[PDB]
Design a protein around this ligand. Structure first.
Ligand SMILES: Cc1ncc(COP(=O)(O)O)c(CN)c1O
Ligand SMILES: Cc1ncc(COP(=O)(O)O)c(CN)c1O
Lengths: 404, 402
């Protein structure tokens, strides 16, 4: 299985055999997009050296990013990775008032650096006194499920209790950080109202809200540019992080914050940005705009959701279809009474889908949630093909399991 | 103000005025090198997706890097920055035996991430698990050129840190040093210092991290790696490298031993990127094809001789130090105390910039003129830079002496 070439939503092995890419969201506008390559080439022939001479590309990119965000999110710091962006977000939050503690979600994954291992319970084998883990707002397998009267308040009340317990111990809260939807956690979309209530409680403790959009930003949710905007025009994080999807896979990432948080940081340029990275970033924003990729994600996402609802109706292995736009999870279960993760069945389905040249993966803490997050040029034809291959595989698998 | 174009060792403003770049060592083989651009373009039109399909570029690059290093340094982890490489080096060290403490040098700078602030005393306006050893600076440090054996006296400081830590029931993961300090003001430790430190750290179960992020890839002229200036028998356990390896593209690497890698794998983020490895291979090919290591040796030796004559003529020059195209000019108000000439250095940078030479001043007192250009820097560039410096120092010392 040796991939050597990729174009748009497809990958090719050394025999030129075509594979449907449902995995590499980082190739956000499509693999080897000529418009991105051209932007990179033009800037690489001129200048690849950082803004001690505040370069037109960097100024224009930061203005264009800021234009996609709420009013108060106006100051851009450029980094080389989603992980660097998250590390900077924790420093901006901790420097803001000198509070040290960070509240994170169960099964969160924020990146692979030292500072991020500490706040990424997905990767806990050693848990620090300055990190608190709130129950993940998962209404399928979490502490409060779809039958609860008000899971958004019940989950948000868990954060308020962490805050009260920390205050009672004389500790202070720098930040609450959440993936706007959890990737590794298994495609978790928090309930309506949850983030807004959490932000209110964190603001009461002098903390800030960090929204990690590293996986879910740039129009993937179809209905908005930013996954956090799902929660209404009145939900505004204090810090937003973004990763390599913004560069179509080039090492570029960004943190956007408020004047107030930036000024505290200034009181004690590495984050000025790179001309080539900003040329690539601008070409990505232009392509999302010119090719209606946010609209594509909305339409193809709605089509995928409808196909998968019909798959759920005839396949008992399907416990839950969740997601929005081109961010979808298919939660596979051994039984509906207990929602027991179908880990071994998920691994088998990925192997069988790969034999039919569909590339996907399984996440969630039990590795049972099939993940769909393709390059944004994924078509209804690609969606139908993928689901046709899945239907066949599920039918054969459930007939085998159901055999005396 | 205002650079829009750069080629080789030169930068150009929007009027096409030419500037001599003595600053951007990250453009290691020269700004916008066509052979690096060509290699990036070819790979970017094919595949930019990480080795879940262990890519020929990544395998070939890691083999080529490993070939430039001592035998035991054979396992490559790829990252996006020098900072990411240093963060990974600390995790490799701490995971190796579960020791937590890191010994760093005074005035060290290892990067801008959380984990690196803690071990970068250049940026302290310290954690219990960080110990700061006196920097082995024979011009302004604790032990100077008149000491009988400064390499032993500096190494003995690390032994004492190790003993005090052990006595408190603490354990040492690592000793980390820039092979030559950049921010610290172009500091070349004495012969024997690193080898003695490595023996002491090895006795504590610790590992030696050599940070080559600024000083690697043939810059020292006499060797490929700055650490090899301490002899074929000095071998770090972990070596970090940064964006110079990609001519300024975000690529960086950690190389360690099988033993350290196996302890780490007991718990492909670091598999590398096809485009990054294509750029990396083009950089290695250019250093080889253009004899850039040889250029750094020859032009470096010429620069040193020019600057030795400037020192004889100019009392503001306290110390000329460096090797190849890593040079510091330590400016002093007086020789009795070696008082840093901070205000004079700022003035000299401003005047050199008016003559279209770009340099900077580091050291903890910002008095050390730094020369670390792209590696294609010529003897003609060296003569020009020094000619402009001579004139500026003559005018400045005549003014001060009225
Ligand atoms: C939420 C989140 N944050 C950060 C990262 C880090 O990615 P990168 O290599 O660009 O640091 C990832 C994916 N690795 C992620 O899913
Ligand atoms: C010794 C050293 N290490 C690491 C870095 C980090 O550079 P970056 O992480 O952006 O590539 C620097 C640059 N100041 C450095 O001088």
């Amino acid at each position: 299985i040796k991939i050597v070439r990729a174009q748009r939503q497809y990958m090719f092995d050394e025999n030129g055999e075509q594979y449907l890419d449902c995995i590499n969201n980082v190739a956000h506008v499509g693999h080897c997009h000529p418009g991105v390559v051209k932007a990179a080439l033009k800037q690489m022939e001129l200048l690849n050296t950082n803004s001690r001479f505040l370069h037109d590309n960097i100024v224009e990119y930061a203005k264009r990013l800021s234009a996609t965000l709420p009013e108060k999110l106006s100051v851009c710091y450029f980094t080389n990775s989603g992980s660097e962006a998250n590390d900077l977000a924790l420093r901006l939050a901790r420097q803001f008032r000198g509070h040290q503690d960070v509240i994170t979600l169960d099964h969160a994954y924020h990146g692979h650096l030292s500072s991020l291992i500490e706040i990424s319970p997905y990767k806990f084998q050693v848990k620090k006194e300055f990190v608190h883990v709130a129950p993940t707002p998962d209404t399928y397998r979490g502490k409060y499920r779809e039958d609860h009267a008000d899971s958004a308040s019940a989950y948000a009340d868990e954060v308020k209790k962490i805050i009260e317990d920390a205050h009672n111990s004389g500790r202070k809260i720098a930040a609450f950080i959440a993936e706007s939807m959890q990737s590794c956690g298994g495609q978790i979309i928090p309930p309506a109202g949850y983030f807004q209530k959490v932000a209110e409680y964190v603001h009461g403790a002098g903390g800030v809200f960090i929204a990690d959009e590293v996986q879910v930003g740039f129009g993937r949710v179809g209905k908005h540019f930013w996954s956090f905007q799902m929660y209404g025009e009145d939900f505004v994080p204090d810090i937003v992080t973004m990763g390599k999807p913004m560069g179509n896979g080039h090492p570029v990432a960004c943190v956007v914050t408020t004047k107030e948080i930036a000024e505290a940081f200034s009181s004690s340029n590495t984050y000025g940005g790179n001309p080539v990275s900003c040329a690539v970033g601008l070409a990505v924003l232009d392509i999302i705009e010119n090719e209606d990729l946010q609209g594509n994600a909305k339409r193809v996402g709605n089509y995928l959701t409808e196909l998968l609802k019909k798959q759920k109706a005839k396949h008992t292995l399907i416990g839950d279809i969740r997601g929005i736009g081109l961010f979808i999870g298919i939660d596979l279960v051994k039984d509906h009474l207990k929602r027991t993760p179908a880990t071994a069945e998920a691994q088998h389905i990925i192997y069988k889908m790969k034999e039919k040249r569909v590339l996907l993966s399984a996440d969630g803490p039990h590795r049972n949630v099939l993940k769909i997050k393709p390059p944004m040029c994924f078509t209804e034809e690609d969606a139908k093909f993928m689901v046709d291959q899945l239907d066949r595989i599920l039918t054969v698998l459930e007939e085998a399991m159901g055999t005396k």
